[PDB]
Design a protein around this ligand. Sequence first.
Ligand SMILES: O=[N+]([O-])c1cc(-n2nccn2)ccc1NCCCCCCN[C@H]1C[C@](O)(CO)[C@@H](O)[C@H](O)[C@H]1O
Ligand SMILES: *[C@@H]1O[C@H](CO)[C@@H](O)[C@H](O)[C@H]1NC(C)=O
Length: 765
Amino acid sequence: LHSEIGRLNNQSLLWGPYRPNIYFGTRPRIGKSLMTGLMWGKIESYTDFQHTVRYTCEQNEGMKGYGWDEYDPRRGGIQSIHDIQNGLDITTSFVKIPGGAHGGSWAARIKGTLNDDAPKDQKTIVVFYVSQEGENSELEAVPSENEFGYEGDVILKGRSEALGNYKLVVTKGKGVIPQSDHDLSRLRGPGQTVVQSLTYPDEVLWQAKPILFQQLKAGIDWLVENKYDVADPPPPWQVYLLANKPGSGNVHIVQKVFEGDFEFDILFSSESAGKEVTSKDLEREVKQATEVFGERFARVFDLKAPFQGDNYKKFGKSMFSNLIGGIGYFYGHSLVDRSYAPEYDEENEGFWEDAAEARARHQEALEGPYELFTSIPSRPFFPRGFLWDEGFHLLPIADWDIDLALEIIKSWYNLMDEDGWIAREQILGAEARSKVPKEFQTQYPHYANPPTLFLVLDNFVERLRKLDETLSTASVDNPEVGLEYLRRLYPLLRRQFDWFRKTQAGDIKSYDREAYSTKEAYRWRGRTVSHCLTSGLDDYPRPQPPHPGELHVDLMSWVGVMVKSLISIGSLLGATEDVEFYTKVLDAIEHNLDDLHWSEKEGCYCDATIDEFEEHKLVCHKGYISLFPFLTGLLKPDSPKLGKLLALIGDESELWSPYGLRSLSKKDEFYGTAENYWRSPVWININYLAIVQLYNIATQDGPYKETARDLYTRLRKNIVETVYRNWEETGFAWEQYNPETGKGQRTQHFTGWTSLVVKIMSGHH
Ligand SMILES: O=[N+]([O-])c1cc(-n2nccn2)ccc1NCCCCCCN[C@H]1C[C@](O)(CO)[C@@H](O)[C@H](O)[C@H]1O
Ligand SMILES: *[C@@H]1O[C@H](CO)[C@@H](O)[C@H](O)[C@H]1NC(C)=O
């Protein structure tokens, strides 16, 4: 039965607009297969199109905004793009139609509406670009009746092992197609839809922009050669319209030119399914998908006071659809340093210099291929998998569709190497690598990242304890299915656990350090003088200078989170030997957090180092780090230490700003210094953990019940309102928020853990 659900899930999730790095494109969850992409740009001159054409996602002054208004990966959705540079409001509707044996069918509608400021007679070039990778697969454009191109639809017929037979149609569409009275029209046609069919070596098919331009340039060179000149030039758009050359190949370029408003359809018809997909099919399914999205939203993200109003609902749908709409499929090789240079052990004072020398050896090599199905922090700036981010992304997603979340978790854990390492950033394939400078592609098997995917597993366990609709929840509705899933994953969870304790271990035994356990102490590998990228909190101040004797309270708390989940899952599977080992580790972390990390003087947890005189020193910087035991759910509700932390959380002169909790205290000497990344700004991911823990204390008997209730109420309010105010003003989710002004700053389109706001609004943890 588990196997059966598995196959139905596979078939449900196969097709998607799973190329979030571009404005609009489709690929299936198959490494070497059929991919599509949309390009458009106005043409006003002989030289402008190369600067106006749009393809990969960006964010600058020429783009107002873009994102998904509604999206469900099983059904599809609607995206809105607001392009100032090209004077266009664009809609892309995508819809999946289940059927046959091959992942089903889909269709898309592309609609362009000139905005008020555009010339009514603007010429806009639109290209649909289609590639297919694979040794044995075929794809052919049926030629037109007409000499020079297509009056009606363009049909591509193709076959592959993965997809069987299929047909992909690009429809004629609605809108004025401009006509040229030039001489050139005797050879190139007055103006019509054109197709060029080409072939390149498989591994470069993703390079749609250069491939397209190489064709445009050959078109222009042909003009020059055949005596078309500045004495009498064809209009720009006709100079940039490819000569029609349909045929067979692994690349097909479908090009149309429109004057004014346009719309056209893409219909992918899986032959193994019923009748083929029509435009009337698409309209119906689009309407239907909306309805279903509407209902599921109202049940799953039913926003509680004071966010019940329709304004916060629109906001909620936008933050949610952009998060779930960022889901991508990636495939390819990664760049890994597999030297295990001894310098990476970081055992010496000055270790950061040793490690730089090992890096300078450049022993990294491509390895794989790997695949990954994950959501992402940002379409324009970070369109790829991030380990601790994904823990946050999946919390709202799991509410929506637990089976989908579990798929993504599975996908991540399938990357894990024999040692238990998962790279904190998954740059898979040359396409993914094009967006990342060479110097930052290399992954390092000694680099951890917070194990936040365990939080999702906690939510799933608690749910398990207590057709598209059915599949979304099959893993909780059929207890048998959930347990089997946990059975298969449990070994990998434990391998990761062991890996942390093996590679991220701190040094108790070789220093004058007293503590309850001699085992439980952690230090993030990978720190530089100014940074600790592996912790997730890039530049939060840490002991200076870095030192093999450092201990990190955040890392120890993350180990706590892991043991707790291993206890819960271990029990469910009855692994009793295991459960008792974990129990004693948890016990030891509880004591050791106090012995090594608690400052009585400062009233909070701190990182530690060892002195000039080789004794243990607490190093306190009041901020997110300081609350870690509390954030991660490790403190007893009656704890006096907890009450001291509530004091710190609540204190306006420290952490509490009108906009949410500051990353670092205003009192800390490092407040707002250097790059000021994690040294004052408000971050939604950590605010979310605080909110969730405040609510936990607020809805149980204990001494802090009422303080927690007050803080919970206020902090939920401030975080949602800060994110909502900025969304209203700017159209975007931001990476972080300014505690002095409330303004969003750094990266836009950060959905991204900023979307946790949908969960905070809807309450009832
Ligand atoms: O600055 N580069 O070296 C660089 C430049 C480009 N680039 N610039 C122009 C073209 N390409 C691309 C990549 C890199 N990588 C180095 C890493 C520095 C930025 C790290 C920020 N990490 C935050 C976001 C996030 O990492 C993800 O949400 C969270 O996980 C963390 O927690 C957050 O703190
Ligand atoms: C989906 O099914 C195909 C064919 O059965 C299989 O090879 C593929 O790995 C599946 N995808 C995953 C791992 O989810």
